[PDB]
Amino acid sequence: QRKKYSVYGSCQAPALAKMLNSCPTFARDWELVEMEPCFVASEEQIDRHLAETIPKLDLFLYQPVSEGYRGEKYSSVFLRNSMPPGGNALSVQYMHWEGYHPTVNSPYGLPPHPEGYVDALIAGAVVMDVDKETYLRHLEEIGASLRIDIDEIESWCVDELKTREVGENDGGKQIDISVTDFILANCRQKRLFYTMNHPTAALMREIAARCMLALGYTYSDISFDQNLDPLDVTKMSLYPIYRDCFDFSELNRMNEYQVLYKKKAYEPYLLEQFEWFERSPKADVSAFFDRVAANRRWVRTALRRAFE
Ligand SMILES: CC(C)(COP(=O)(O)OP(=O)(O)OC[C@H]1O[C@@H](n2cnc3c(N)ncnc32)[C@H](O)[C@@H]1OP(=O)(O)O)[C@@H](O)C(=O)NCCC(=O)NCCS
Ligand SMILES: [Br-]
Ligand SMILES: [Br-]
Ligand SMILES: [Br-]
Ligand SMILES: [Br-]
Ligand SMILES: [Br-]
Ligand SMILES: [Br-]
Ligand SMILES: [Br-]
Ligand SMILES: [Br-]
Ligand SMILES: [Br-]
Ligand SMILES: [Br-]
Ligand SMILES: [Br-]
Ligand SMILES: [Br-]
Ligand SMILES: [Br-]
Ligand SMILES: [Br-]
Ligand SMILES: [Br-]
Ligand SMILES: [Br-]
Ligand SMILES: [Br-]
Ligand SMILES: [Br-]
Ligand SMILES: [Br-]
Ligand SMILES: [Br-]
Ligand SMILES: [Br-]
C-alpha cells in the first residue's frame, strides 16, 4: 500500500503534485489524494476534505493560507490540525518574484482582466496622459531605469520572500521548504518565473527536489519528467535593456508575449494594455497605480526618468 499525500495551496500546489508524481521513486511510494486549491475549493469541498481526506493522510504538503484569506475553514493551520497522529505536515513557500517583470501586476480594484496580468507602468503612463506611441518609443529608457535599479528590485523581492518565511500566514510556523536563496543565486542565469507567481519547470523541479530531500530521499532517487512545465499558460516579456542582465535573453528588441497559450508581439500587446486601461475611469487607474507604486519605488522612478 502506497502512503497517501495531498498538496494544498495556490495554483502552485497542483503543479507541485504533478512534478512529484513524475519521479518514479516518489510515485512508487506515494498516492496523491487531490485537494482543490485555496482559490477554487467550495465550502462543501473543504468541509469534506477535513473529514475524509486529511485524517487519512501520511503527508500534507501545503502552502501557507491565512485565516484572513477566506476564513478558518480554508486556512493551512486549521487543515493541518486535523492530520492523524503519525502524519507529517510540511509547509512549502508560496513563490512570488517580480524581478523579471517589475512593471507587471494583477489589476486589483479594476475590472477582471481575462489574462490576469497588466502592465502597471502603462497604468501610470495613462494617468500622466502619455500616449501609447510615446510609450513604445521609450521602452529602452524605461528598461535602462529598471537596469539601474536591478539590485534594489532583487533585494526587495528577496526581503518579501524572507518575511513570509516566518510564516504569519501559517500561524507563525516557519516555512519548511523554501527556495529564496536558490532564486537569488540563479535568477540571472536561468529563467525561473514566467509571471510573478508562475514558476517555470526549472524552479518547480528544484522545489519538488527539496520536498523529496525533506522526506528523506537520497539524492540518487530524485529525478523528474523534464517535459513537464505546469504553469506555462502565460509568459511575460522582459523589457529592452533590462533583459540584457539575463543570460537567456535574445538579440531582438523585446520578445513576444504569450497570453493564454497564444503569442502576441510586444507592440500590439502593449497597445492593447493601453486600450484596456483607457476603458476604466482615470481616477480608478490612478488609484491602482498608486497602490502598486507605494512599495515599488523603481516603478515611479522609471515613469519619471522616461516621461516627466
Ligand atoms: C497568496 C495567496 C495564496 C494567499 O494569500 P494570503 O494567505 O492572504 O497571504 P499572502 O502574503 O500570500 O498574500 C498577500 C498579498 O500579497 C501578495 N504577495 C504574496 N507573496 C508576495 C511576495 N513575496 N512579494 C510581494 N507580494 C506578495 C499576494 O499576491 C497577495 O495579494 P492580494 O492580497 O492583492 O491578493 C492568494 O491570496 C494569492 O495571493 N494568490 C492569488 C493569485 C492566484 O489565484 N494564484 C493561485 C491561487 S492562491
Ligand atoms: Br492536485
Ligand atoms: Br497542474
Ligand atoms: Br497529478
Ligand atoms: Br463555496
Ligand atoms: Br493564519
Ligand atoms: Br502540523
Ligand atoms: Br484579474
Ligand atoms: Br517605437
Ligand atoms: Br506566504
Ligand atoms: Br532559502
Ligand atoms: Br542555493
Ligand atoms: Br533559461
Ligand atoms: Br524551465
Ligand atoms: Br513522511
Ligand atoms: Br553514487
Ligand atoms: Br530532474
Ligand atoms: Br519565455
Ligand atoms: Br529561457
Ligand atoms: Br528575455
Ligand atoms: Br520572440
Ligand atoms: Br469604455
Numbering used by the authors: 4 to 311
Task: Please give me the paper's original passages concerning this structure.
The principal CPS of the human pathogen and Tier 1 select agent Burkholderia pseudomallei consists of a linear repeat of –­3)-­2-O-acetyl-6-deoxy-β-d-manno-heptopyranose-(1–. This CPS is critical to the virulence of this emerging pathogen and represents a key target for the development of novel therapeutics. wcbI is one of several genes in the CPS biosynthetic cluster whose deletion leads to significant attenuation of the pathogen; unlike most others, it has no homologues of known function and no detectable sequence similarity to any protein with an extant structure. The structure revealed that WcbI adopts a predominantly helical fold: the N-terminal 100 amino acids form a ligand-binding domain fold, with the remaining 210 amino acids adopting an entirely novel fold. Based on the structure and on biochemical and biophysical data, we propose that WcbI functions as an acetyltransferase and requires another functional module to carry out this function.
The crystal structure of WcbI was determined by the multiple-wavelength anomalous dispersion method, using data collected at four wavelengths. No radiation damage to the crystal was apparent after the first three data sets, so the exposure times were increased for the low-energy remote data set, which was collected over an interval of 360° to a high resolution of 1.56 Å. The coordinates of 24 Br ions were used for phasing. The high resolution of the low-energy remote data set was crucial for subsequent density modification and successful building of the WcbI polyalanine model (605 residues out of 622) by SHELXE. For the correct hand, the correlation for the partial structure against the native data was 36.5%.1 The full WcbI atomic model was built by ARP/wARP using the polyalanine model produced by SHELXE and the low-energy remote data. This was found to contain bound CoA, carried through purification from the expression host, and will henceforth be termed the WcbI native structure. The structure of the CoA complex of WcbI and the native structure were refined by PHENIX and CCP4, respectively, to resolutions of 1.38 and 1.56 Å, respectively. The native structure contains 38 bromide ions. Interestingly, in the native structure the CoA terminal SH group points away from Cys14 toward Cys41, perhaps owing to a more reducing environment of the crystallization conditions. The two structures of WcbI presented here, obtained under different conditions, suggest that WcbI allows some flexibility in the CoA head group.
